[PDB]
Amino acid sequence: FNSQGSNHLSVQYSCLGGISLGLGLIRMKPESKSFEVQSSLLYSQAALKISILNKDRDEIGSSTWSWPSQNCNSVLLKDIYKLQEILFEMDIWNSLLQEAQSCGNQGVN
Amino acid sequence: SSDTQQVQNILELEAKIPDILSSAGKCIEAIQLNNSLEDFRKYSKEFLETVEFISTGLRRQALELEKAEVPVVSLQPKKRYASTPLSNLIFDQSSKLI
Amino acid sequence: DLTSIQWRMPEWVQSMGGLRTENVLEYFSQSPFYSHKSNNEMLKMQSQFNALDLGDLNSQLKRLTGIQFVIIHERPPFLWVIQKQNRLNENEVKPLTVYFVCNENIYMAPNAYTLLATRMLNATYCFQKALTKIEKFPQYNPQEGYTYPKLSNDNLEENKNQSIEPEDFSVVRAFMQSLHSSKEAPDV
Numbered sequence: 001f002n003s004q005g006s007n008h009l010s011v012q013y014s015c016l017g018g019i020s021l022g023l024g025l026i027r028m029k030p031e032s033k034s035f036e037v038q039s040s041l042l043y044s045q046a047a048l049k050i051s052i053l054n055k056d057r058d059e060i061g062s063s064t065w066s067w068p069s070q071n072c073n074s075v076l077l078k079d080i081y082k083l084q085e086i087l088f089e090m091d092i093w094n095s096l097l098q099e100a101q102s103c104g105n106q107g108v109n
Numbered sequence: 110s111s112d113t114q115q116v117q118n119i120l121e122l123e124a125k126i127p128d129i130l131s132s133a134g135k136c137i138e139a140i141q142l143n144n145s146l147e148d149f150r151k152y153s154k155e156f157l158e159t160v161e162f163i164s165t166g167l168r169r170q171a172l173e174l175e176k177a178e179v180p181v182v183s184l185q186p187k188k189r190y191a192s193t194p195l196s197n198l199i200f201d202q203s204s205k206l207i
Numbered sequence: 208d209l210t211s212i213q214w215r216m217p218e219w220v221q222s223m224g225g226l227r228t229e230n231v232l233e234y235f236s237q238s239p240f241y242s243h244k245s246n247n248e249m250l251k252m253q254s255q256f257n258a259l260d261l262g263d264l265n266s267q268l269k270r271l272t273g274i275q276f277v278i279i280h281e282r283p284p285f286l287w288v289i290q291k292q293n294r295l296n297e298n299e300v301k302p303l304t305v306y307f308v309c310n311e312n313i314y315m316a317p318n319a320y321t322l323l324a325t326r327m328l329n330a331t332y333c334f335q336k337a338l339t340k341i342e343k344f345p346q347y348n349p350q351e352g353y354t355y356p357k358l359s360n361d362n363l364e365e366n367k368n369q370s371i372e373p374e375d376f377s378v379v380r381a382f383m384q385s386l387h388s389s390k391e392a393p394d395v
Contacts, residue, residue: 001183002367007350010183010370017189023371028351068202183369 013037013080019091024083034076039083047089065089115170115177122163129159214238215311229264231287231308232276240306240313245274246294270297276306285310 003010006025014022022039029036051062067088070081103109110118133156139148191199219234220226226234235241242248246268250261261267268275272294280288291303304315345353376382 002369004367004370007352007366010367012186014189016192016195019188019190021186021188021372066202066205068198068205185372 011037011080013083014087016084018084018088019095020087022083022087024080037076037079037083039086041086043086046086048093115174119167119170122166125159125163129156129163132156132159209240209315210317211314213312217311220311225284226287226308231278231289232264235276235289235306235313238313240315241276242274242291245276245291246271247274247276249273269294269300272296274303277302282308289313 001010001012001023003023003025006027008026008028010023011026012022013024024037024039026037027035048065050064052060054060067081067085070078072078072081132152136149136152136156139145139150139152216234216237219237223230223234232241232247236248236251247264250267250271253267254261265277268277275292275294276289277292278287278289282288285308287308288305289307290305293301293303295301306313306315345355347353
């Protein structure tokens, strides 16, 4: 798709879908020979840690989300998958804590 | 040509233009330096071809783009949710998540 | 050479105390600009013959054929117009350069076209020179566009329309505006 003042393309990295729309700002990177792409992220990487705090809020149960691993020939497309994964964790946890609204009806806070 | 192939045709059409300037500097060289009418007699039968034939190739890439009739407006996507490969692959992860 | 250049032997004027009438052609006779087969000088040769038979100047001059340096417009006490000419008859004249008293200098009058060509040449030269040690620094790209390479950019630091769906002042501009309003806020 057409993009902004960047003159580049506006590819939808989030072609597979999620919630909030996502298009990568294609960007030439002279060091890379290829042309590495980034978005609005300040974060270098992101996902979703989970764990069970005790009465002392010591660890009990715990885990963390992990995406299935794409292994496409183009690492660029792989990073499209990565930014997809990012917008994914975004839209989900943001929607959830946005929904946190009335969590208090059975003690959840 | 289909998909990228028209664009690819332009991509290898890319280098077809800059050397036309070599042919043209030589068009000047024909009398400025080489001092022979025969040279530009040939390159006027070359420069105009190397330029214009590419120009026609371009104008036909565009007019036949206008035959292919690709829409110019970008659709505003609905907030897409889940394509099937995404869904079942997430299920594959769920197996991995077991 | 014939333009704005010094050629002075002031002590002659120091003796004369300045020019009078025919004595302008004396210091002018000292000048290269003076011609030898001018009627002023061939009848200077007449001064070396007849001597007495020259009158003022123009009577003996213009009646006789050849190069001359006639006087028409005095500008006391500095300039005096004196055009070069070539009589072809006792009646006919074929005027040349207006030599003029540039004060301790006398010059041929330049063509307008000379200076005009100087202006044209120097201006287009400024254009071409603008194209010289300046051009081809903004290297073109279809994508990047023109480029401006640097060891360090700072200092400071037909496409697409539809896309994704500072103000270096910290709104300081409006703050200054408010300062304009507020400096006389008590006053107004």
